[model samples]
Target: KSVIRWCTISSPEEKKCNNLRDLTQQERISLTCVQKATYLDCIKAIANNEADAISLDGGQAFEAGLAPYKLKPIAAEVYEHTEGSTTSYYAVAVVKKGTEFTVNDLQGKTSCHTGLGRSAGWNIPIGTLLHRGAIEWEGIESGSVEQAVAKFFSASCVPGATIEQKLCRQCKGDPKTKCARNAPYSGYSGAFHCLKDGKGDVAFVKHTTVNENAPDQKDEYELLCLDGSRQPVDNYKTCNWARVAAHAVVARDDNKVEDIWSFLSKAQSDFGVDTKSDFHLFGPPGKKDPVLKDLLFKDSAIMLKRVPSLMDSQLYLGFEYYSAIQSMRKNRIQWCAVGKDEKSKCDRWSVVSNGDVECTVVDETKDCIIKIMKGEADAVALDGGLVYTAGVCGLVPVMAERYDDESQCSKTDERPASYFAVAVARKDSNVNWNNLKGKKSCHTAVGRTAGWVIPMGLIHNRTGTCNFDEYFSEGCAPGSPPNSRLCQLCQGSGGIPPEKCVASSHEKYFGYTGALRCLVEKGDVAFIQHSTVEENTGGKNKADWAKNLQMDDFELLCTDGRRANVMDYRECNLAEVPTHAVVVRPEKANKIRDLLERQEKRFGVNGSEKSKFMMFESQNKDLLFKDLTKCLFKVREGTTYKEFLGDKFYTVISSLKTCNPSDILQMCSFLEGK
Candidate 1:
């Protein structure tokens, strides 16, 4: 529709909004105003389609972009910076000229904040401290960033702050509005006043707050620089803690953003500041309403520019600042755990990761995928098959589990991250790839790469039928139908049926390690990764079943029907498939990669410092990640899941569709419209 349903949060804002509506009517552009009690309410209204758009500060923009309300910025209110019109302003820490302390000396000092949720006042300043590790917050208890900040500073005046009494210790409001927005020291000018009157050691505000409040005395204030130095207020461009994003008009992610821009572009040119119209699009109404400033858009904003097409709230706020906001909100990477054993390890990781991670347990790998899709969980490491399904569900690969320990992590040109899929059997067994018709088989799981997909695809191609149960007399293909002969040889933890024939670590024969164990105790051959036998045998594995086993005890079954040593897998394997990868929502890919990289440095095999926690090694079979994985390497930028899983492997996965149409893929396809 040509109508713009603008959502407003206040009576003054709505009045200005109605004036715009009255003027737009003459131009045949229908303008409707929808009122909300709060900016957050306005955010929800715009997100739910009750209203078309609303201008939001960077902080609210982040909130609007999250889960339930996936709104995006369409245009930004551009204000005057030192370099003329710009879409951002600097967040500076202003101190008295005589102060000797730098940004490094802010801790334990009294502070002045404009308001609790304002971008430059609270978000950028506190986020800068948190990101720099100056303020310690583990999210172990209370989880209140306000409490962390209150304790970091001896005392402070943060208006509109409800929690942490010390945050409002210097607020000069009446009894009811002390620390509230109506307090004496509540806005930029007021916070500067707090610093001027000596109630605070430093004031956190916009770069020009000092100049605006004390034009002649600007030389009295100094700006704190990140490089442990301080300079005059005019040096904000080089001395500010962070350059914060300007307020922007946000709309539903799926809305026709260009149309909104067209309306705003037309309106601004007609009723802009210098125009002859009775109304100013970027300024407040005449002196009658002098108290209500910045009604529709900030008074200082000279123009509005269309936001970049790729600019979502996260991208608009930028990574560092976005992470700071998330940190302040106590958001952690919720690692989706697939089984009891995995959950146990994940719990340990959450503690050892020093609060960067949080464990969210599920019963199956697909359940983790579903949880991630529903935004109930964050990330999970998955095999190629599951990664394919995750890709179909709109998730993406952030990092891959690398097995080559010799390659540098930064070297993307070394080799593609992949592993060989092979069939392993006891040297004493008479089994060969040619005479495998009646032999019992073991598989990591039914939908995995090495464990099932490649081997099954090979079997289907040769047999010209999908009757694998008939070809193999008995087998332990976890995730197969429970009553099928394929699951006959399977055993669960404690031999319970509930955990039997399952696709998780709870099953006794569920992963590369489990398949090898199945072959060792029950089956004639095991379909597993090439490194499986070597990793489990020859002192590599200390489990009771594998401790005494030697690498020579097993050999690989060649695709050409010859037998080869386990290490000779390169010459006799089903296929070389991509390694398991951590999948997450697209927006979280970068942050998750950063978190995993940080985690790797502390707990990976090459950790520089000694620690009890090991991320890649596990006593039980490959808990969260493969035990054989050397490190997690970042995926190539902009690589889709289809790209991550090469053309050949995707074709192999699709080849199995003749007999087995995967429920998840079918569901994903159905969701994509048959």
Candidate 2:
């Protein structure tokens, strides 16, 4: 019960592992040495339950967590550091001072890297480029990101990888040992030497590489910053590409992690770096064996600490580092945006999100839905009615957009709170809900829940006619035909004809704010959510048009043909509708959810005030996602569209679907051969 079968890679490592076992035999805890040919073999042995644990580099641990072998880090090696200490080191870019270039200008410059697959040299630098869109990789259909790196740099010495001649051109090694560990331009110090000797323009290495190699000439080197500035090498804390974790002890995910940590925790007490014990665990091999380095743990490590929280490889690697690696290795979420405004926001999100999400712009929501179904896109935030269409087309709800400031990642067992669909009218107007048959109306967009579905469904039942044009004599309903009376009051950039009445924010009167603006400047009534009036009026929105508007100047048109104050939405409203939700294929629901959850924490309201991108708040109209959204909450378990929409709202959306079916439904029907 107290025995740990430690996995060792080579004969030299096995000798040290056996020595550790021999020394531990005197204690109550038992240690067994299991030999393997390589680190991958050790990972395989652990996954097969033949071995208990092995120490792996962060990059190796990333590989171990994938595919058939699912392993997690149970403990980490902590090296000596005088700063706010942890098991992490900074990956920095060292360039000769006065080189007159920044990180953004390194496109075709020669590079010096520690080695391929190395944390500081290869993974962090290459991954950073991929994360910032500096390099492009088109998934497996194309070649690996390694090829992209070779093309991005003019020439480089990436030791372990020689995929291209340019990748090995900077190396000083002979032909046989070129572009490998045997090369002169390999590893941290060697790579630094490459930059110092002017063989390469820049060197990708850890923070200590420059100071440790050229201490007297440290001022000659500077770090290239992400913001296009240069700083002294000592400013790596703010100038590094990524903070990489140290080598860690990894085991099978289902294995007893606590048991492994218990053994490591006790073993470190007797054979830690400060120990005077006859046999040292972290100490270098003595005269008997000098060939092996970093036997069970790195020789530089001072001690071992238990890895907190059952952190899997991704978590152990940290979000930024994990995301960088994922950009090099896997597919990122292609977020589908409807129009120009949404696409612009999505593009900003791609960069500020650190490349977790990519933007794919389309003309309409129907096109976005179709692209997602065809696998050209991955995810989109959809209103309730569109969620139904997406659900019918094989997409599922991943998370619900929460409007309140409550916890975003908390357990969301209950349905998300719904906003009231209110008929907002001028306070002095006599246009009641019943008298609105021939009045001018403004709607968010055609087929949208609060804007079109609920109001149109109510009018359809009352008049027994699906013809909304006859019911409202004049109106601005985005997505309608440009020549129709429905688009008479619509404005698009004040003069653009073809863009008039488009479903996107390109049309001035296109969204919640647009609809309200139509009521203020043109229409008699506006159909929008309850929060629209408050969000845009009384200086809450500091825009030129909305800054002077007051919430008290508007009233809600009740179903009973009476006018009530704007704040009386609960008492006087057309209908209650669910907010937007992230829709994705069932297979990708978990991945998209995890990605969005990570994104919200960084860009949401709780994030840093100085953050560049705001996930919830945009310029004026809501783009990509709603402005009222405070955070994203995980949808309840087994939550399909109908369940998420609930009974009454689902019935209303179903009824409206029959009156004027969306283009998406027709596409689905055509694909079904109906």
Candidate 3:
């Protein structure tokens, strides 16, 4: 009884539009076609309140859920598969029968596809390809996918790639005749034609492609499994590149969701495949001068499955596929580095990832984050505070830094995922958390999280001043101006460059141990990590400054206005903040996550007992990433960095800092994405 505004762009979109007219005539539902320049325009329509819903390819659904607009899938096209009818499909890579390459060994190969941005043809295959190191996703002047595809494949049939002649060389025709859906050899069918016609080495298309295009010759081709093995195309249930959830009906989250579902269920109920009625639940494939072939629905669907009203794109399309869309859209991912050593480490890490990844260097950590926003760099690792800053600037935390626990025989699951930010003071100090006005403070570095941000934030909460310099008698807050009251106590690069006293370890009193030394000889209190005391004191470390130290010499001040031994930080610590995290733009998050997982297991500590090189094992902290890092693992869905940083912690930090991050953040963004 309600009208749904359906969007249409091409003949396919419009054809679906025509059917909506007939569909509303009898069913208790109605629809009107809204024309647009392209599929993207339809998504914009939803955002602007001009349209209600649109059926998106799994690939398109990812973008529909991002910031510029917010749309969620409410229903999905289902199909008959090995188990039963399901709401997912497979992306496959097909090759000539004797083609001797596996997903693990793709070298100098060409490909054909429905087009860039489609799920099976582009996003899925590109994700698999780049992530597997089958090919480097680069070497194009245009810095666009069109050029990358043209360079990777000798020739391809990507209909939408007008950037190069050869990229579309095997394509059927122009926007009007051949390349568009009107051409028999363009989409699911056309991509197969390129493979069968010897136009390419590998063909990126759907699992049902060969069955629908060349049923009898199925044996002549094989599917490329993500496992790097080859299998008959007919066995797609188990053997395929990746399983992609099928296309879905998308709309603004607050749209007339229930009504849209009602119309869909009613239309399918009356005109579904088993229906004797002349109408259809969806559109038909093939045979056409073509007003459109796939109208409101793809012919391949057996039925439509209802999706939850509030499911997001990633929740419905799944993270991997959503990530692939993000990865493929960016021809290459730039991994930013903070210093020469970290940059060198990044260079070493990049070589193993094929050319899909490249390293970019910047002097400090904040520059690295800004580069990501400027599109100069795609990713970098960060401690929780930097993760919060990165998120503030539109980057996402793809995963967390997993540190291995040695005492547990490297079976580190039982260890806490994060560490505590502790406030350590000499047992002789006359102050506790309640009143510490004139006592001098020592910090690892200016903006450091464990050493500075968290502890300083808490202090600001207690003192109620944006001016921390006036609150603390004096100390080396490294990144603060060397001449400012905050850094007045700093022992500058031992007076070398003088500026090294700013935000780096170059400053004499700048890092975990350095700050501890400051507390031992100068300050009344020190802000640092829980492990800092354990590692530097207790006779475990014999460094000249710390060897005389004993655990009994210090105690931590709890927020409850009492003192506790340093070792009992779990309960008495200032705050438990998140560990380092891998940060990347949302679009490229999946690819980076995939790459990190593979690379880390290959080269990280405890990665391979027989491995020749361990990725990050060292005496140096935060070189590339924490030296103690065991591996990188995905961040849980719906978890924001701000949440990870803790609301109380974030609010505390927000209260103290007041300059442009460029103007004043290290003095917090110092340290790793940690």
Candidate 4:
């Protein structure tokens, strides 16, 4: 009868296939079993066409380059034909009966093995011996069973015992037997005998041997368990061995295997004659037992390519599919970050969206951008201004523009358009524009459009010359243009300015003073613009110097060119720059256009107080998948331009609070798209 060659080794793990053999018999497939010593050897057999396939642990198969033919795990709970018929086994190395030593004493001992066939017989033991720096082996000698036995006995007499233990050990409860003393050596076939005729020290045997022999051989001879932890009892003797799931291995020429659904169904039903003992199938669309969902389907397909006959797919494509599979497994979704004031609001949206979405703080723009670009996040929430800028890089804007009104000047070609400019100063300071001419000022860091761009533009528009560079260069140059006279006071030597001189590190800080003094300090700039100064300038005269200065000491100087003579000649014609823009990525062009269209419609038809409030509230909202419904609801209720804006702002703020900062900025950048 033709036989299907199935390889396995004598070890505790092989017991799992004991019932599998019976299953194969029931299917009328004669099992031609080959007893190999290690899993690596079995892989080699398959590679050389000596065997069809072999049952092995997943991790071992992966390590042996046989991952393609590996099997997927079907069940963690194993079923037996008869209760109590199944028994645990162990593997170990052993020497002759009369040696005085423990496992630790076996360091540098020589070892012998039948050959490599299974991890339980070879890999596990070799790995353990190496880890403990114990025994070593050269190679397994190949010959007839009789010749090999002769050589084994001959080597047994060699000094220090020429034989060493294999990886696994099997125990059957024989008191003085080598197998029982160190059974189930953690999946390795334990050493049974050494070459030397003389008694040797440190033998790997079965645990049952030790348990039984310890009572009888209590004196002259000692039976030791290879317990790394030195526990009095062996856990492996009773606990079931660890096993990995089985995977399907198909030939490259088998096109039927290419279709995942077909392959899975066939493998689970009628692929091999040994229907009972052959490989079991797993994955989505399972008939009765669903090991995993559709998300794991892709992963299962990729994993099936480990068989020697199935290694046809390119590596790069496999990797790409693997990433997609992982993403699906993680249930990842895209999220947009908008601004929000309350953590509860953020939690509400995130929880409502099933924890797949959330927003970030508004101030974290730069970090948010990194997250989106690096694939750490999917979306962002942002204001119309910032959204337009980031959208230049391909950020999609899902939310509509909320701010639209004549007061906002959405179409104005001016700094900040029609929005308010904030002016922050020391409380009770009489140091308005005129008196601030040569005083120091402070502002946020540079390169910020709102803090530097719009404000600087407004100052230049009011003043005549762009003296910011000259003003900041004073300390660098003794006779810096506008400070020519002051340079002489410092003897034309570059140094820090005096306390009374126009002391400032950068012209950007001059916004604290009125517009006039800002120009004077910069030797030209007249006015500084900001957005909403109320947050910082509210309340009492907390500022000491400003409280001491009186109204007569300063004045809110005008850029009407009245003091042109008093100011340096170079301080003229400074403010003709265009307003900064909120751009979006080119990829988000359609989305941004949609937003623009919605804003125009609402602002044009229903501009009202409710609409304005809604728009304000939504300015920096974060958006999640569920927010899509809320956004639609607000749009329908907009009724008029004003009411639309009110609802729009509320939605915007709501979305902002849900998004990460960079995502928010990316959304804001939609305006920059074509």
Candidate 5:
């Protein structure tokens, strides 16, 4: 048989996938019990041809519109009692006549909701409360939406509050049936009646309940005003929360849905509504035993309306519940940082975002990546060198920073987003990129982008040897041992001989400026960025430090075997390094990208600094985020961590890491995000 299938959830919708299939005229279908959000997974299956049509709650419908394959909400369940047989319904927070609590007074008050993730029950209510400034939604972790709402409300009946059983405290029914939506007081009518019993302070539900269930007692119910007042339920138009879009049946955008429509029409025609099976077509009553409710269709659906396209469903699903659902799918993402300054950047971000993004402070760059791998923190911004290291540790880089630069930049006429890794030598040294085999050298620690990785990696490929120590007669790599030959070419901090050549910023050759300083007084050359000498050696830094220093006296040695003055770096330089990026776990890649782009636009260097609320003015290295960035932008969708780092650069940084990619090595956090 050419079976056209429909997906069904279990328990309440038991075997109904087949039941409906058996009733179709020209089409036949098979069955499977899909439950909860997993029904959205079936949407993926439908995309893959492993499944077919599924009736979806709005939440599932939202995801159905996304990737792997696209889906369309081909049909909608409608209600005649609703306005114009429309699928939209109003969500309301109804209270009694004398309760004296407005929407603002809802904090810590008891509430009765239908269930978790349902349109009217969970999503609409929590979403409205938050937009109305009632619930502090940002702080609630994903996977515990109902529990958070439960705590916000003193005691309540939420049929599917999984994490906290107490939230289901008021459920009155058969012992085993306590948490089901079928429990005596749970869904639309159930939630309202619980409020009628005076067992709770509020009922978060739909607008039409009072008018339908107790038309005469309608005056007793009122909609809670945001201003601490009330209005009769009949005044729902302005008094209620936002109207919610109804449930939909989604099919693969590639599938022919007209067949589905024909089948549904026949089933209703044969035994539906008009007393054929004596059950409701538009407003069917839920069955007992197996406890089926809202199964094949909504309790009040009058007809199956054809949707114009998937775009029709999209207009409804994610409108308000998008981020709130993100709040439920994952925990508040913890942004990892290094020190007091770095932590400060994160603190400002968290406060501005109302705690939607939080921070986890680690002692060092490597610690940040490790914590991410162990699930300690979600992500951090790292340079290209460390972006490579993090990619190895399994964190994903979702967004990359674009900068105003000088090399092969983007199309916007901005400077090359990539910076040049150059070998800066004294102008009179007569040294070219090639004439430095036996000279002493300085690096910005080890795995850093401009300092060690790019230079060492290029030389590794050119020379085909791992002996960098042998390659460079002697080197003062900051992270090297204090007594190793690697530290032999040392002039420690403040001319203290013992402080020379150790691994740390305290070592005069520890970072970009530090590496240039080592060359300024003690070493023959500094392996750093093109702008390094200009940023620090222009004579105003300190008379005691740069008493004789001049930018004109330093020159960059090109890896192409040429030399050019410091300011002419665009004409001759070693290698171009990509910008730092914000990294996150794969599951959270999308949100972090969205979050950072918004952050940079507001608190970035060029952003509004009116109140002195800054995010990137780091006194230290780029902490939490880049100090110089104008913005962090999204990479093309589907680009993973390794892809963002680029295979070419990842291999280079990895070659250097083989020698040492330690925390002290100065890679991402040290050099980028992975």
Candidate 6:
């Protein structure tokens, strides 16, 4: 049986061909190669029909568009039946250590080529150099390799024949030398061959040449590290020195090996015998080669057998891709349990279940709900009101249950209760529901659920038949009922003072009046919706008005005309109200919800236990009494209290002490006389 032939442009193609021929005798290949030149040129040759195929870097192959056809890779085998034709190499350029210049320094600078057309010497390094900066072709002086080397060295120094002098002596010894005058050069083959005799500031050569040849071939010159500092040849460090895909062993385009699987399996074995299997090696054969792993299964079966389209001639595989995918999978496997919170749980579950289902806790009351929804967390325990607001903006709510109650109760003993709004006033005030009927009452703005909704609900719930417009209209009226002095006084008619008129006839008129009786008392107009007015006031006021005014000072007024002023000031049965709720992003919803739920369970119901968890005592009765006493004491002195209390307490105390006894007695006597 005859065998098919294979060829490549690699410098050691003859050796590679011989090894492949020995292993697969059914496939006989004659090595006919060209001079070693740029990888790009070799690709161009194949593209232009100058050669059947070529071995080159994978990045270059991809850049050149040659893959399974003109250039395929040989696969690795367990037994060493053949020499692995492909070798991994790294492309690098060297500059003087502490050079302070980068790859861009080669722009408008001379570069030396050891060989006029060698791949590493002129092509790869030049491409890297050009990529760093704009190439000035006009500045490039092309000539013999020796002339290019001389020009590179001469460009780094002042005009003189002292080849041994330091490159940029006028720029200060070593550290301050700028690439502007002594730019780093690429492809110094002559300097690489005789680094001891080289005069250039930098050089480009094979990693093996620098590591093995420089010190062994000479004595004066040593391999410079990436930083340009002189180091032992073996100790030199190269920048960006990772092994990369260099080439692939591809089947001929004209050959019937259209599919990679068929091509690799059907080619003749190295032995001249009539072998039926294991013919041509397809890619760079190595255990570390990612391209090989991608094309071949772990069991060494060709992937193209199952995925025949993968054998497209234009596709090139490389080891980097395999390593990248392996790294990605490894990372996903390792960090699956990275997060300790609900978010982590959700993420892990998503990955495990292929993103089919997720679980998260939520806290809708938290302001970070939006952040959570943005993937910061999996769930959020949000307030019902906040959830509505978020809903208005198109954010969805997963759990729609109300979490808090208006009435104070323990979580264990609390009933499933609804929220309602109420109107309250100081119990001691002369105001009543009917008194407010024809009087001006203030309510908070609309968006405020607690402030507006509660108060509105309170009015409607109490009246049973009254709406907001009717209530407000009745409150704004000028007088009370007809045929009554109350109306006369309230309407400011008959030339009488309104308060005096109203006081003169209590039986006829007793209800809330829009007018303030006096300016000395504090007044409040609050909306009481889902949450209690007490809660709002509790957080704002200095006193426990809820407890203190529960019996007297504060009262819930009603508009039931039957007992207008009978003082029925207490909690009234009303419909449930809505509360402000917190919301979070979908991702963080679960975590936030869990946290808030836990807090709710631990603190329970209104979470009064948590509310009282502050460092200071909110109800400071002693402080109030002391302040009241100080005010009374100032007033008793017959001088204006504000005037008596100077800017400083010391001044006021001093004045009080300095007062004559007779003056104090006189003020006391005057008060008594009045």
lDDT of each: 0.79, 0.78, 0.70, 0.33, 0.66, 0.33
TM values, all candidates: 0.52, 0.51, 0.48, 0.26, 0.45, 0.27
Task: Give all candidate RMSDs, comma-separated.
Answer: 13.3, 20.7, 14.5, 26.9, 17.5, 31.2
- Residues 214-309 of candidate 4 have per-residue lDDT tens digits of 334323333334652222323433321221123223221332223433323334455322345433322222222111221111112212222222
TM-score of 4: 0.26
Model 5 clash number: 19
Ten-residue segment with the worst summed lDDT in candidate 1? 284-293
Give lDDT: candidate 4, residue 14.
Answer: 48
Superposed model 5: Cα runs more than 4 Å off: 1-333, 339-358, 405-416, 488-507, 539-544, 619-627, 654-674
Tens digits of per-residue lDDT for model 6 on 529-593?
32233332333433332223222334555444222221332344222443222333333344444
Name the best candidate (by lDDT): 1
True-structure lDDT of candidate 4: 0.33
Q: With candidate 2 superimposed using the best TM-score fit, by how many Å does residue 417's alpha carbon deviate from the native?
A: 2.4
**How much is the lDDT of residue 529 in candidate 1?**
83
TM-score winner, 2 or 6: 2
Weakest 10 consecutive residues of candidate 5 by summed lDDT? 665-674
Whole-model alpha-carbon lDDT for candidate 6: 0.33
Lowest lDDT block of 10, candidate 3? 665-674
Give the C-alpha miss distance for residue 294 in model 6, angstroms.
27
Instruction: Please give, for residues 1-674, the per-residue lDDT of candidate 5 as tens digits.
Output: 35565555444454554554444444453234444334545676788776678877776677787666678877777655424556667777888877666777778777787666677777777876766666655654433556557667888888755678768777777756767655767667777767878768788777666665666777787887555568888787777677666678888775467666666665666656665664444445432322344565656566676665324343435324554565556637688876455676678778876777898876556667666654557877776777766775456677666556312222433442566778888878877777778788888776668777788887887787777777887878865666576788766665434666654444556666667767877888888777767656656456366666788888788776677777787878776678777766677777766766566556665556525566655443444554445555567667766676667666666666665445423322311211
Better of 2 and 6 by lDDT: 2
Q: Write the per-residue lDDT of candidate 1 for residues 223-271, one digit (tens) a residue.
A: 8888887788888878977878888788886656767888988988987
Judge candidate 5 at residue 436 and give its lDDT: 76
Order of models, best lDDT first? 1, 2, 3, 5, 6, 4
| Backbone clash numbers for all candidates listed | 0, 0, 14, 163, 19, 82
TM-score between model 2 and native:
0.51
Where model 6 places Cα greater than 4 Å from the true spot, the runs are: 1-51, 57-63, 66-88, 93-111, 114-191, 194-201, 212-228, 235-244, 250-674
